[PDB]
């Protein structure tokens, strides 16, 4: 019983093409290229969902270091953090970064508690 491949192929191709919408140039056109480009996209995605978790801690820490450095002459990120722990506070770095921007006065207070107690 002869079987033409029929649409079984074209569907697959089409469902790939949908993926690759808005790729500049022949990456959005030719099937054969589109394949690869799909794979690479998916791959980067996977990679950078891991990079992401690295990079926001990067960021947050940076912003925090900026936010503290303003108060004391001699004060750091490092110093700060060590002080947060020996005072037993749980706040992670996302929260201290977002509170650094969006509620600056709060961070000033926190610093004043760590200082009072280290005193």
């Amino acid at each position: 019983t002869r079987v033409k491949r029929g649409y079984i192929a074209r569907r697959r191709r089409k469902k790939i093409r949908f993926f690759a919408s808005s790729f500049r140039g022949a990456h959005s056109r030719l099937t054969r290229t589109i394949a690869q480009q799909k794979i690479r996209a998916l791959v980067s995605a996977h990679r950078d969902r891991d990079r992401q978790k690295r990079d926001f801690r990067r960021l947050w820490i940076t912003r925090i270091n900026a936010a503290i450095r303003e108060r004391g002459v001699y004060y750091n990120y490092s110093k700060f953090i060590h002080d947060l722990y020996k005072r037993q506070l749980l706040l992670n770095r996302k929260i201290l970064a977002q509170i650094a921007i969006l509620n600056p006065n709060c961070i000033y207070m926190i610093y004043n508690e760590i200082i009072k107690k280290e005193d």
Partner: protein, 170 residues
């Protein structure tokens, strides 16, 4: 009827005229009149005043991530095991409570502080495509993952007041 009339007149008679669709009966309401302002209020509404909330926020720990919650708002979290839709739950790990008048800083936790929230929904996340690929080793693995997720609504933040506040006082 004025649609059937103006369409049959723009059909039969080519090159339509303004007098036929808009008769000279209508002068429009005057720009300072109440009957102008009810229309212009209908179609171009003024932005409505924001609904009231308490001014307060808390930093709470769910599934070991720390959220900033403000009451009246819903957030996404880890699935809470054995939580059902329309359930009243209390989040008991509370690190920080701000009020524009004061801020309570726990060591580690604000004691007796509790966040009353209601579980409005149980979901699955947008599908993340996990894709394992090695070049030339002729190996690819396409695998979707949909994380289970719980959508909860913060109602109120309570039982802080007794705890010692601090403040910036100049």
């Amino acid at each position: 009827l004025k649609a059937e009339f103006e369409e049959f007149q723009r059909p039969p008679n080519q090159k339509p005229q303004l007098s036929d669709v808009l008769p000279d009966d209508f002068q429009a309401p005057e720009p300072g009149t109440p009957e102008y302002n009810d229309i212009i209020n209908q179609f171009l509404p003024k932005k409505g005043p924001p609904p009231p909330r308490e001014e307060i926020f808390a930093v709470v720990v769910i599934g070991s991530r720390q959220y900033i919650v403000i009451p009246g708002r819903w957030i996404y979290t880890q699935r809470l095991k054995g939580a059902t839709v329309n359930d009243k739950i209390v989040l008991n790990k509370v690190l920080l409570v701000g009020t524009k008048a004061s801020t309570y800083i726990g060591t580690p936790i604000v004691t007796n502080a509790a966040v009353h929230a209601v579980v409005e929904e149980q979901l699955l996340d947008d599908k993340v495509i996990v894709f394992k690929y090695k070049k030339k080793k002729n190996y690819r693995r396409n695998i979707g993952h949909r994380q289970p997720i719980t959508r909860i609504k913060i109602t109120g933040i309570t039982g802080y007041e007794d705890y010692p506040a601090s403040t910036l006082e100049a």
